[PDB]
Each structure stands twice: as C-alpha cells, then as structure tokens.
Amino acid sequence: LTADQMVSALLDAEPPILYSEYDPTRPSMMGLLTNLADRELVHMINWAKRVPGFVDLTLHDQVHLLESAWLEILMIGLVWRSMEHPGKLLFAPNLLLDRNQGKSVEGMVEIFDMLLATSSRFRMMNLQGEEFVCLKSIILLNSGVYTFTLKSLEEKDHIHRVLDKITDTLIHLMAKAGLTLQQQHQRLAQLLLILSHIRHMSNKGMEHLYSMKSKNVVPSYDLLLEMLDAHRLH
Amino acid sequence: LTADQMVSALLDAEPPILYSEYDPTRPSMMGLLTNLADRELVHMINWAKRVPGFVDLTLHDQVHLLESAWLEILMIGLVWRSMEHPGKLLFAPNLLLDRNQGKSVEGMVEIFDMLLATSSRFRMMNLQGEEFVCLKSIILLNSGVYTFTLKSLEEKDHIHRVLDKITDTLIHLMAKAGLTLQQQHQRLAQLLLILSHIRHMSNKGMEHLYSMKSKNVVPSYDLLLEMLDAHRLH
Ligand SMILES: CCNCCc1ccc(CN(CC)c2cc(OC)ccc2[C@@H]2CCc3cc(O)ccc3C2)cc1
Ligand SMILES: CCNCCc1ccc(CN(CC)c2cc(OC)ccc2[C@@H]2CCc3cc(O)ccc3C2)cc1
C-alpha cells in the first residue's frame, strides 16, 4: 500500500461513535461505562481486522495483541472524541462528563484527570484525524509484541515491518502538510511519547477493573478468541 | 548546546554501576533488590540534575518528574546493563540472575520476563550508548509532564523544548552513523515505542511495591524533595 492508501484504509476502517444506553427522560456511572465499552469492543474487533497487516498474523497472536491493547484503544478514542470539549470527556454524544461528575466513584476522578490532560495535549498539538488513526493502529500492533519459535520470529518481523510502514505514513502526512524535516521528526516523537501516557492510563484502568472482582468485566482470552475467530459463512 | 555537546553532557552525567551488598563468601532477593535500588536512587538525583534543562525547572516540578519516572529509569538502566547477557538480568556485576531465580518471589518471574524481553529487543536493534542516554533523559522529562498557572505553562513549554532538542540529537546520531532519512525516522519511532513498554513494566512494578505495604519502599515526595533540594555549601 502507498501512504495515501494506508491512510484511506484506516479512515474507512474507523468504528462508529456509540451512544450510552439510558432513558434520557429518567433522572449508575460504572454501569453506563461498562455497557458502552462492551458494545465498543465488538466494533473494535471489526476495526482491528481491517488494520493492514493485522489479519496476516496468527489468530493466537491477534488475540494477544487485542488483549493487551483493548483498553488503550478505548481510551485514545475517548481522548480524541473529547478533544474539542475542554474540561469534559465525551464518552458518548449523550454522556459528556466533567471531572466533578467522576467524584461519585472512588478512583474515577484520578483517571478522568489523566484523560482530560491527554485530551488537552491532543488539542494543543492540533492532532489530525489522519494522525489519530495511525496512532491507534500503532497501539494495536505495539502494546502486546513484548509478551509473545520460527513462527513467532516471523510474526514479530511482520509486526515491525507494518509498524515501520505506519511511521512512514505519519511522516508522509507531515511532509504533505508542509512541515520541515526537523518539524517532522519532532512531531513524530511528540505523538509517540503520548502513547506512553496512554499505556500509563490503561494500566491504571486495568488495576481498577481487576479490583472490581467481576467475572466478565476484563475480556478473557477465550472471549476475545471467540470474537476474533469468525467463520466465513456470511 | 549542539547535538554533539548534548551527547557529551549526557555521557559524562552517567551514573556508576553499583554492586549488590552481600557477603560473597556466604550462601533475601527482595532485600538485595531493595538495597541496590535505594543506593542507585541517590545517584539518580545527581544524574537528573545534569540532564540539560532539568535544573531550570522549579524544584516542585523536578520532584514531580522524578517521582513519576524513578522506577522507569532504574529499569531502562537494568535492561541496558543486561543487553549483552542473553536470558539474564545484570542487576549488578555480582548479581546476574536468570528467570528461574525469580520464581522464589510471587510476581517476580512475570516482571523478570518483561525486562528480559526488553533487553532482547535492545540487543536486536543494537542500541547504542548514545541513544540509550537520550532515551533515559526522555523518560525523565516525559513521564510526569501530564500530572502538573502562568508558571506551569512556562515549565511545560520548556520541557517540550528540551524534549524536541533530544529528538534532534537522536536524529543527528542516526544521520552521523549513515542512516537514510527513512531509516532515521523508522529507528526514532522504534526506540520511542520501547518507552511505552518501559512505562508498562514500571506500572506493574509500582503495583508490586504498593502491595508490599512498607512505609519507605516507595520514595515519598518529601523524601525526593529533601534529596533534590540541596544547598550550595559544598
Ligand atoms: C470491553 C471489556 N469489558 C469492559 C468493561 C468495562 C470497561 C471500562 C470500565 C470503566 N473504567 C475502567 C478503566 C473507567 C473507570 C474510571 O474510574 C474508575 C474512569 C474511566 C474509565 C474508562 C475510561 C476509558 C473509557 C473509554 C470508552 O470508550 C468507554 C468507557 C471508558 C471508561 C468499566 C468496565
Ligand atoms: C528507590 C526507592 N526505594 C526502592 C525500593 C525497591 C525498589 C525495587 C524493588 C524490587 N522490584 C520492584 C519493581 C522488583 C520486583 C520484581 O519482582 C517482584 C522484579 C524486579 C524488580 C525491580 C526491577 C528493576 C530494578 C532495577 C534496578 O536498578 C535495581 C532493582 C530492580 C528491581 C524493591 C524495592
């Protein structure tokens, strides 16, 4: 694929923005966030299978990547959605929350605060949609590569080749916009350093989920495999 | 500073490699690792104060950065030390451990495994010492920038300016070595993506320390401030 075709593939693969399920005519938070994220995950699977190179991996490796990255992907999506809404997190168009509304759950305002900080950072850098889809694909391919035989060596080589292709695509987007070569590598670095903070927020979020001690709230490898291991009957 | 002078400053600022304290004539693990890391932290402070731009920050902001980054810095140092020792972690020249020797502590082999994976990754990329010192400085300036007034806006602007200068330095190292422009941004991206895994390992390690429920094992803000807030009487 060319860089322009890579971008086009990623934009067309974008998942939709889902709504929270609550009667708007009625006067709770963990349940809304749980239901929303669970519905988003199904669309995640569909999106990941359209990330170029992802379906060339073994199904086992596909599951490992999604297992490691799913919460990071949910959060970067949230941060991107919330970019143009200072001080608020657009979990859904009908669920736009501020940090005060997170005080009703222990541990929530801390996570809200980091998401709000990342969204403000996105805003100051004026993150573009084309950069955002590249970053999200990078998360999917990178976050689990470190926890994977002759086959595994070939899978890791392919992942790094795709990641390199995404780097080239980000640089190409930046060159097309008229940035100097110095501005290009400076902006590439700034965007990739943000991914370390997204990892950070995900780990804090995973801590919260595991503390909930709920059977199904963290998606199992078997569930993720069931979702990814689709048949060809449709 | 020029890029060559930046590199020279970072190399000269490097901390020493400390030894574990144990009678080698005698026949335990958490205690050795605790003592070693605590002695390393004092040298960390000295090193951080020599990272160009770091001492231009407020002392409050200096402490915040070190509080967020100290375990990441310890682990990248470990991974770098262990690079030329496949399957082992060189905690110290007299404490070279394999993953089997981590099975004696619950949760240890999992952390060992991620450190070993990162060290193998360093080895395959043939990480250079000049790149390593740049990456370590990036960790110090980046890992806490998201949890910080007119003064704070100026502090964050300065941090991003220094980070941009470190990006330029990494690219300069790569250009001097004869890499193409494409190889330069591909390698920059590969190195910065590794920092997301170092964040990951640090968060898992922080989880372990907080579970220990030991008063002094996680350095307090006040302790870090006491260490950083030095007088000019020597
Ligand atoms: C798919 C498998 N089962 C998912 C079940 C599930 C998922 C998420 C949560 C809520 N959670 C866990 C980190 C959370 C908690 C907070 O304070 C404690 C603050 C913010 C959050 C996220 C922040 C990102 C985010 C993005 C979205 O797109 C949608 C929701 C959220 C909530 C509960 C249960
Ligand atoms: C400075 C303030 N007080 C520090 C007190 C302290 C620090 C560290 C640890 C041990 N720990 C916590 C993550 C650990 C535990 C493991 O399994 C459970 C495996 C590996 C580790 C690290 C891996 C990196 C690393 C690098 C070094 O340069 C030296 C040691 C280590 C151990 C205990 C107590």
Tokens representing A215 are 């059977």
DSSP-based helix, strand, coil % in chain B, nearest 5: 70, 5, 25
How far apart are alpha carbons A62 and A230 in whole angstroms?
A: 12
How far apart are alpha carbons A230 and A113 in whole angstroms?
A: 38
Q: Which residues of B touch A185 (CB under 8 A)?
A: 167-168, 171, 184-185, 188
The residues, ordered by sequence, that sit 6+ positions from B130 with a Cβ below 8 Å of its Cβ are B7, B10, B11, B173
In whole angstroms, how far apart are CA B162 and each of A188, A213, B138, B168, B196?
A: 15, 43, 9, 10, 20
Give the resolution in Å: 1.9
Atom 8 in ligand 1: residue holding the nearest Cα? A34
Q: Gaps in chain A (C–N > 2.5 Å) come after which residues?
A: 27, 148
Closest CA to B103 of B92, B90, B115, B113: B113
CB B192 within 8 A of CB A194: no
Strand partners, A90: A96
Determine, for residues B182 and A204 on separate chains, whether the beta-carbon distance falls below 8 Å.
no
The shortest C-alpha distance from B160 to chain A (Å) reads 8
Q: b vs e for B48-77, b when ≥16 Cβ sit within 10 Å of the residue's Cβ?
A: beebbbbeebeeebbbbbbbbbbbbbbbbb
How far apart are alpha carbons A148 and B113 in whole angstroms?
A: 11
How far apart are alpha carbons B42 and A13 in whole angstroms?
A: 50
The shortest C-alpha distance from A212 to chain B (Å) reads 16
DSSP A171-213: HHHHHHTT--HHHHHHHHHHHHHHHHHHHHHHHHHHHHHHHH-
How far apart are alpha carbons B73 and A120 in whole angstroms?
A: 26
- Reported as type and span, the H/E element at residue B164 is helix B150-176
CA B197-A199-A218 angle, to 5 degrees, is 110
Q: b vs e for A31-49, b when ≥16 Cβ sit within 10 Å of the residue's Cβ?
A: ebbeebbeebbeebbebbe
Q: Please name the residues between 200 and 229 in chain A that touch chain B, using a CB distance below 8 Å.
A: 200, 203-204, 207
C-beta neighbour count of B12 within 10 angstroms: 9
The residues, ordered by sequence, that sit 6+ positions from A21 with a Cβ below 8 Å of its Cβ are A32, A35, A36
CB A139 within 8 A of CB A72: yes
Tokens representing A87 are 């001080």
DSSP conformation class of B219: P
Determine, for residues A199 and B200 on separate chains, whether the beta-carbon distance falls below 8 Å.
yes
Determine, for residues A188 and B184 on separate chains, whether the beta-carbon distance falls below 8 Å.
no
How far apart are alpha carbons B135 and B195 in whole angstroms?
A: 8
How far apart are alpha carbons B47 and B10 in whole angstroms?
A: 9
Q: Please name the residues between 55 and 114 in chain A that touch chain B, using a CB distance below 8 Å.
A: 113-114
DSSP conformation class of A219: P
Ligand 2: does its nearest atom lie under 6 Å from the Cβ of B198?
no
Whether the CB of A186 is below 8 Å from some CB of chain B: the reply is: yes
CB pairs A-B closer than 8 Å: 94
Query: Strand, helix or coil at B91?
Result: strand
Tokens representing A32 are 């809304």
Query: Strand, helix or coil at A89?
Result: strand
CB A130 within 8 A of CB A7: yes
Residue A186 is nearest to which of B113, B114, B164, comparing CB atoms? B164
Residue A185 is nearest to which of B167, B203, B204, comparing CB atoms? B167
Determine, for residues B197 and A171 on separate chains, whether the beta-carbon distance falls below 8 Å.
no
Q: Which of B32, B33, B98 to mutate to test the pocket of ligand 2 (most atoms within 8 A of CB)?
A: B33
Tokens representing B232 are 């000019």
How far apart are alpha carbons A139 and A70 in whole angstroms?
A: 9
* Torsion of the alpha carbons at A60, A66, A68 and A74, rounded to the nearest 10: -170
How far apart are alpha carbons B91 and B136 in whole angstroms?
A: 17
How far apart are alpha carbons A96 and A85 in whole angstroms?
A: 9
C-beta neighbour count of B29 within 10 angstroms: 14
CB B199 within 8 A of CB B72: yes
Where would I find the H helices in B13-128? Answer: 29-48, 59-81, 108-125
Chain mean position to CA A45: 12
Q: Is the sign of the CA dihedral A220, A223, A225, A227 positive or negative? A: negative
Whether the CB of A171 is below 8 Å from some CB of chain B: the reply is: yes
Tokens representing A13 are 């693969």
Tokens representing B106 are 């619950």
Going along chain B from its start, the domains and CATH numbers come out as 3-228 (1.10.565.10)
Phi, psi values for residue A98, rounded to 5°: -105, 170
Closest CA to A93 of A83, A106, A81, A75: A81
DSSP conformation class of B19: P
Residue B203 is nearest to which of A181, A198, A203, comparing CB atoms? A203
Phi, psi values for residue A95, rounded to 5°: -150, 75
Query: Position A1: which residue type?
Result: L
Phi, psi values for residue B97, rounded to 5°: -115, 150
CB A205 within 8 A of CB A71: yes
Chain mean position to CA A213: 24
